[PDB]
């Protein structure tokens, strides 16, 4: 369940009291009576206002987050905490625009554990205006992926292995190293 | 997925914390502070955030997938030498029966074609690597001689006479002979039949006849591959329907008796030509264009059949009519192409738009007709189903009974016909093509994009193979078809093997999205059989045949290939099983007391091999299981 | 496509009078009104359909879409006074010159960038010069009295009048006096092109003629020019000063020089005007909005352009006890305590909302950013406008100069502006979505690699893209040929050199291909 | 030394046969032109290209 039930305390922007008709705001029992049926209606209203914001990753509730990841392919399995699926829902749709590039793959992995990586791969772009001249790029290839961790706890090195194997191109052979 | 959780019940009743009222039932005032139209209010607001994903899935630009068609290969046979033009015209819908409950399916003769009433010309005879040197030609009515030689060489081939050759018919010979001395079984004689065209030679497929071949009397009904073209010799003009000859072929039954040649006749009983599940609708225009760019137009016929050239519209260009291609998105347009997009799943065709740019400027994608010019579709297709595909050909109402013709039959069950995909279908497709976005790359899209390329596999992993000499490592596919439990209880075997087309049809879609340069493979996993024998004792106040029953069948189910394992789907593909996870099987099944032991081995799918005893099984990574008949010893005092 | 209905007409509530509770046998016109006047139902229902345009913006932001930004027009202001007397910052920064205004619309308002200051130039040194006769340390040609001859009577390239400016101030429009002696066959001033210079720091700067009697000094004329930047002459004599050079082009067909031309008498500098760039801009002061309901979520309009970017431009007073606080812009409302005062601002429209709220899947609530109490009142200390096409003001049409602070003058502008363009509208970007989303960006297929280099080389003939085979190392890299284009001569030959490609071409393809790259394939080009 | 000769022998012998066809033969696709003389050299600019 949510348990989103009613909001003691909040009002409303479509008050009953002030629909009613004239000489019939004289009264006090009426006005104070009335008034009251506000207080079960009064959420509705400010969920029908301010209805953006209950898109947005970066604000909406934890719920809606990772409703929000399944939306766009967020890849949102196995993180228990709110602030990391903040930042994955709403970088994810850029993610993909490039997933697979070099940048890509740099990302991702900064993503999910904060800092930038060092990778060296065979890879690399040239241009000779020699006719059918060669084109450099190590024969052999070779994916390596280096974390500059601060507190390498031994099950990083899992998680890096495991992230990385969905961010290579079914390509290349990879290896992990993390500090 | 929710915005509020309240319910009718749901009254708050806080009057008193303003006023002091204070009847918890009254006759009246209680009846004011129930307000049903909350309810009404608020379960239409849980719904909200559902509307609001179709609101911008539209915005992304993703749309449903237009239904397939249907197609089938049908012939019109007529049991006649006659009938020198097209028999059925184009349409002549067919269907199964029409029961009530279930509506029979309806198709169209697609094509047509003409054949020729080809005579029987010249005969001869010859054997591998000997021309025919015979009499060529006096054995249209008489000069007999041995067919074959009598002997089986290597390539004995037989030259035949028909003049006005047909390129595209059933074909069917007068072969007349005298048989008597050694009978041949018809089943499979060792002989390829072979005919001429532009390129070379092609397998004749052959039908029905009541004589298995220079065994009795009769004709043989060859099937002309498309292609074939006229050839001379002599004094006729008789295309080629060479008749290669095996060997014994490891003990098919052969003649050294083979008959001679009586006569010669020329039938040339029907033609080939394919038929859909769709119907067509010609010329119909859209209106006319307008000079402004990113117009919509409309149709009359809901569900568009997908297909290369899905509408072909044309414009009124000076020259009779310009045709316009078809993309599925417009960013790959040019300012000077001609390309335009179609909802099929609602008949929408819209043009190519105009982008302002940052400068200010405009960017037009694609071009637009020019103002004042007829827009005109060629033809669309309309159809297709699930229901669409026939068994076995079988369709009733397979025209027994026809005043012109003696018959029309498909005998191969049609293929195709994908349904159009529900919207709740489209809502789990959105993610795949915003984060794929075509063009399979990373290890995951194969596993996504093979299922777009055929959902009707049961199901699909992809994982990296042995490692290529250069330091690279081709991609390597595993499928596993829907299986049926064919024989008496686990799985027959032969059909988790593709039948050439799974592997054809989507390694094809995946090759052209596949990254230039590297190798592409897919098959079938490994599988090593386990026989699950064992020893329980059973209860003394149970029955040890129904946990006879019981025990080799609820043992199979935790080793089955499709559902097995805890969790009821297919296995993990890499998981190895034990006696131990076994033992939790094993111990639950009703009418148990004690279990003694159990024994463990390989085997394959083939012949036997019942495989050392183990406990343990190293399943490798891209296999699965493969459980067996199993049985186990269950002495006990039963009742 | 199929989007389900959400509608239940006013009328179909009020059915709820369900007269099975006992003595409530009424009609219309009792107090009974509450079954009624909860009609905001009807209300309630037909928002929820609704889907506007607000949550079609964050749909952009959810996919990676920036909506695309408004800018401005920036013209050529240029001042003019009639009283070169001294120097001191006449024009403090933001000035603002505005257009006349007509019957038709408000006017267009705009707002000088730098700040302009007036100088009281005088002359330096006044030299003989000719072709191939330099300086050589001359200073009194004209100081005293008598003549300096101009360019020996014979102007040809190379020549240059040489007079001297004490201040050449940066952004001053300079006067010269030219009295010369009329002398042999008179001709029209626009006859000889003769360029004037002014030999900057970095070299001789070009200069624009605005009067008549200049050059072609037939009468003693009066040439004004704008100063072109900071400059100074080249000294050797006793003049720090600036330098104008009154240098003479090839003899054109139509256009040609005559021998003998006026010589100097008298002569005096001193500039009339300076000229400065401008943004178009302007500053609102004190447009108040209403009064605060006091709950999230509220948005407030502002009635004019999109607040042009830069600081903070729009200052929310609100009433309070103490006075009027005071609320900052802040980016999108990333975190935000309920004890912070912050605010979110639309650059390309007046939309300024508030904190929203939200009801979050437990009890309570979570505001973000706090709200105003009931009955505040909310206004606008500081705004700044100026963005969008209604800046694209036609040649020399600003006249009139707000505030009139200095000793002001005539303002016009010389030159047309330069054009700014308006912001991308929901329904504008709501067509860009489909397109703008899936365009490749991946280079997967052989496909893309010839038609991402011509993507980024639309200049180029032909291009292909062909792997390299087995055998080669590079790691099954690619190969990438590239054709220039070129006219192959009236004469059917073609020369080699011109199939080369340049190599900046090759640059700028390659540094596109190398961040849209897959996996590490190199990709080297070149011709074939 | 990587073709079919099946093929190519198919089509060496019609490829050289349609430029001395009676109604539209030669180099222009059309009748001959009623004079012209037949050599190897105009023959081996068929053969070649084949």
Same mark, same amino acid.
């Not at chain 2, 969790?567 to 033992?583: A, M």
């Given at each position: 369940?949510?348990?989103?039930?009613?909001?003691?305390?909040?009002?409303?922007?479509?008050? @009953?009291?002030?629909?009613?008709? #004239?000489?019939?705001?004289?009264?006090?029992?009426?006005?104070?009576?009335?008034?009251?049926?506000?207080?079960?209606?009064?959420? @509705?209203?400010?969920?029908?206002?301010?209805?953006?914001?209950?898109?947005?990753?970066?604000?909406?509730?934890?719920?809606? #987050?990772?409703?929000?990841?399944?939306?766009?392919?967020?890849?949102?399995?196995? %993180?228990?905490?709110?602030?990391?699926?903040?930042?994955?829902?709403?970088?994810?749709?850029?993610?993909?625009?490039?997933?697979?590039?070099?940048?890509?793959?740099?990302?991702?992995?900064?993503?999910?554990?904060?800092? #930038?990586?060092? @990778? %060296?791969?065979?890879?690399?772009? %040239?241009?000779?205006?020699?006719?059918?001249?060669?084109?450099?790029?190590?024969?052999?290839?070779?994916?390596?992926?280096?974390?500059?961790?601060?507190?390498?706890?031994?099950?990083?090195?899992?998680?890096?292995? #495991?992230?990385?194997?969905?961010?290579?191109?079914?390509?290349?052979?990879? %290896?992990?190293?993390?500090? | 997925?929710?915005?509020? +959780? +309240?319910?009718?019940?749901?009254?708050?009743?806080?009057?008193?914390?303003?006023?002091?009222?204070?009847?918890?039932?009254?006759?009246?005032?209680?009846?004011?502070?129930?307000?049903?139209?909350?309810?009404?209010?608020?379960?239409?607001?849980?719904?909200?955030?559902?509307?609001?994903?179709?609101?911008?899935?539209?915005?992304?630009?993703?749309?449903?997938?237009?239904?397939?068609? =249907?197609?089938?290969?049908?012939?019109?046979?007529?049991?006649?030498?006659?009938?020198?033009?097209?028999?059925?015209?184009? &349409?002549?819908?067919?269907?199964?029966?029409?029961?009530?409950? +279930?509506?029979?399916?309806?198709?169209?003769?697609?094509?047509?074609?003409?054949?020729? $009433?080809?005579?029987?010309?010249?005969?001869?005879?010859?054997?591998?690597?000997?021309?025919?040197?015979?009499?060529?030609?006096?054995?249209?009515?008489?000069?007999?001689?041995?067919?074959?030689?009598?002997?089986?060489?290597?390539?004995?081939?037989?030259?035949?006479?028909?003049?006005?050759?047909?390129?595209?018919?059933?074909?069917?010979?007068?072969?007349?002979?005298?048989?008597?001395?050694?009978?041949?079984?018809?089943?499979?004689?060792?002989?390829?039949?072979?005919?001429?065209?532009?390129?070379?030679?092609?397998?004749?497929?052959?039908?029905?006849?009541?004589?298995?071949?220079?065994?009795?009397? &009769?004709?043989?009904?060859?099937?002309?591959?498309?292609?074939?073209?006229?050839?001379?010799?002599?004094?006729?003009?008789?295309? *080629?329907?060479?008749?290669?000859?095996?060997?014994?072929?490891?003990?098919?039954?052969?003649?050294?008796?083979?008959?001679?040649?009586?006569?010669?006749?020329?039938? !040339?009983?029907?033609?080939?030509?394919?038929?859909?599940?769709?119907?067509?609708?010609?010329?119909?225009?859209?209106?006319?264009?307008?000079?402004?760019?990113?117009?919509?137009?409309?149709?009359?016929?809901?569900?568009?059949?997908?297909?290369?050239?899905?509408?072909?519209?044309?414009?009124?260009?000076?020259?009779?009519?310009?045709? *316009?291609?078809?993309?599925?998105?417009?960013?790959?347009?040019?300012?000077?192409?001609?390309?335009?997009?179609?909802?099929?799943?609602?008949?929408?065709?819209?043009?190519? $738009?105009?982008?302002?740019?940052?400068?200010?400027?405009?960017?037009?994608? &694609?071009?637009?007709?020019?103002?004042?010019?007829?827009?005109?579709?060629?033809?669309?297709?309309?159809?297709?189903?699930?229901?669409?595909?026939?068994?076995?050909?079988?369709?009733?109402?397979?025209?027994?009974?026809?005043?012109?013709?003696?018959?029309?039959?498909?005998?191969?069950?049609?293929?195709?016909?994908?349904?159009?995909?529900?919207?709740?279908?489209?809502?789990?497709?959105?993610?795949?093509?915003?984060?794929?976005?075509?063009?399979?790359?990373?290890?995951?899209?194969?596993?996504?994009?093979?299922?777009?390329?055929? $959902?009707? !596999?049961?199901?699909?992993?992809?994982?990296?193979?042995?490692?290529?000499?250069?330091?690279?490592?081709?991609?390597?596919?595993?499928?596993?078809?829907?299986?049926?439990?064919?024989?008496?209880?686990?799985?027959?075997?032969?059909?988790?093997?593709?039948?050439?087309?799974?592997?054809?049809?989507?390694?094809?879609?995946?090759?052209?999205?596949?990254?230039?340069?590297?190798?592409?493979?897919?098959? $079938?996993?490994?599988?090593?059989?386990?026989?699950?024998?064992?020893?329980?004792?059973?209860?003394?106040?149970?029955? =040890?045949?129904?946990?006879?029953?019981?025990?080799?069948?609820?043992?199979?189910?935790?080793?089955?290939?499709?559902?097995?394992?805890?969790?009821?789907?297919?296995?993990?593909?890499?998981?190895?099983?034990?006696?131990?996870?076994?033992? =939790?099987?094993?111990?639950?099944?009703?009418?148990?007391?004690?279990?003694?032991?159990?024994?463990?081995?390989?085997?394959?799918?083939?012949?036997?091999?019942?495989?050392?005893?183990?406990?343990?099984?190293?399943?490798? =990574?891209?296999?699965?299981?493969?459980?067996?008949?199993?049985?186990?010893?269950?002495?006990? +005092?039963?009742?």
């Amino acid at each position: 369940a949510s348990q989103r039930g009613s909001v003691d305390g909040l009002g409303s922007s479509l008050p @009953i009291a002030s629909m009613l008709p #004239a000489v019939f705001a004289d009264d006090d029992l009426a006005l104070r009576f009335v008034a009251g049926l506000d207080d079960v209606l009064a959420p @509705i209203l400010n969920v029908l206002d301010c209805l953006d914001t209950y898109f947005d990753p970066a604000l909406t509730p934890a719920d809606f #987050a990772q409703w929000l990841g399944t939306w766009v392919g967020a890849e949102t399995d196995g %993180t228990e905490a709110e602030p990391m699926l903040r930042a994955a829902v709403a970088a994810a749709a850029r993610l993909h625009r490039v997933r697979g590039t070099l940048q890509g793959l740099s990302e991702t992995v900064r993503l999910a554990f904060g800092v #930038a990586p060092e @990778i %060296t791969e065979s890879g690399g772009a %040239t241009w000779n205006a020699r006719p059918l001249g060669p084109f450099p790029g190590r024969p052999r290839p070779q994916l390596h992926v280096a974390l500059r961790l601060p507190e390498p706890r031994p099950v990083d090195v899992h998680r890096l292995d #495991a992230l990385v194997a969905a961010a290579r191109p079914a390509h290349m052979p990879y %290896t992990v190293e993390v500090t | 997925q929710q915005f509020v +959780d +309240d319910a009718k019940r749901y009254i708050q009743q806080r009057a008193p914390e303003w006023t002091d009222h204070n009847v918890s039932d009254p006759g009246v005032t209680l009846v004011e502070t129930v307000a049903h139209m909350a309810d009404q209010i608020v379960y239409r607001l849980n719904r909200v955030p559902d509307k609001n994903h179709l609101a911008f899935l539209d915005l992304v630009g993703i749309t449903l997938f237009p239904p397939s068609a =249907a197609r089938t290969d049908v012939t019109f046979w007529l049991s006649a030498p006659q009938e020198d033009a097209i028999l059925v015209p184009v &349409g002549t819908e067919v269907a199964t029966l029409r029961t009530e409950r +279930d509506e029979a399916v309806v198709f169209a003769t697609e094509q047509d074609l003409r054949i020729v $009433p080809c005579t029987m010309g010249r005969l001869v005879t010859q054997v591998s690597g000997e021309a025919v040197s015979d009499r060529t030609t006096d054995l249209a009515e008489s000069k007999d001689v041995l067919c074959f030689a009598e002997a089986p060489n290597p390539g004995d081939c037989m030259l035949i006479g028909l003049s006005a050759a047909v390129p595209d018919c059933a074909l069917a010979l007068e072969l007349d002979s005298r048989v008597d001395g050694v009978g041949v079984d018809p089943r499979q004689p060792p002989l390829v039949w072979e005919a001429w065209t532009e390129d070379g030679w092609q397998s004749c497929e052959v039908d029905r006849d009541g004589t298995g071949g220079l065994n009795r009397p &009769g004709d043989v009904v060859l099937h002309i591959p498309g292609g074939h073209v006229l050839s001379r010799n002599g004094g006729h003009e008789a295309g *080629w329907i060479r008749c290669r000859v095996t060997e014994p072929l490891s003990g098919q039954p052969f003649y050294t008796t083979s008959p001679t040649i009586r006569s010669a006749e020329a039938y !040339t009983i029907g033609g080939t030509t394919g038929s859909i599940h769709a119907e067509t609708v010609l010329d119909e225009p859209l209106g006319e264009s307008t000079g402004l760019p990113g117009q919509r137009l409309r149709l009359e016929h809901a569900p568009v059949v997908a297909g290369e050239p899905s509408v072909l519209l044309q414009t009124a260009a000076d020259d009779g009519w310009q045709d *316009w291609q078809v993309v599925p998105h417009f960013s790959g347009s040019h300012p000077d192409d001609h390309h335009i997009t179609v909802d099929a799943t609602t008949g929408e065709i819209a043009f190519g $738009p105009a982008v302002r740019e940052a400068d200010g400027t405009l960017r037009q994608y &694609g071009a637009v007709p020019p103002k004042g010019a007829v827009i005109r579709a060629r033809r669309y297709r309309t159809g297709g189903g699930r229901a669409g595909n026939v068994a076995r050909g079988a369709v009733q109402v397979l025209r027994t009974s026809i005043p012109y013709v003696s018959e029309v039959v498909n005998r191969e069950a049609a293929l195709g016909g994908v349904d159009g995909e529900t919207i709740e279908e489209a809502k789990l497709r959105a993610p795949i093509t915003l984060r794929a976005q075509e063009r399979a790359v990373t290890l995951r899209d194969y596993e996504e994009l093979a299922r777009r390329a055929a $959902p009707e !596999t049961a199901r699909i992993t992809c994982l990296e193979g042995a490692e290529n000499e250069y330091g690279a490592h081709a991609v390597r596919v595993l499928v596993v078809p829907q299986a049926v439990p064919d024989p008496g209880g686990r799985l027959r075997f032969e059909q988790l093997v593709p039948g050439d087309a799974l592997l054809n049809r989507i390694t094809r879609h995946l090759d052209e999205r596949r990254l230039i340069g590297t190798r592409l493979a897919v098959g $079938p996993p490994y599988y090593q059989g386990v026989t699950v024998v064992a020893t329980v004792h059973a209860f003394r106040d149970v029955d =040890a045949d129904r946990v006879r029953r019981q025990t080799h069948d609820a043992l199979y189910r935790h080793l089955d290939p499709l559902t097995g394992g805890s969790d009821g789907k297919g296995w993990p593909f890499g998981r190895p099983v034990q006696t131990g996870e076994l033992f =939790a099987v094993l111990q639950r099944v009703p009418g148990v007391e004690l279990v003694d032991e159990v024994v463990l081995h390989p085997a394959d799918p083939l012949t036997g091999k019942r495989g050392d005893p183990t406990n343990r099984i190293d399943l490798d =990574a891209p296999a699965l299981v493969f459980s067996y008949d199993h049985r186990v010893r269950v002495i006990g +005092d039963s009742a």
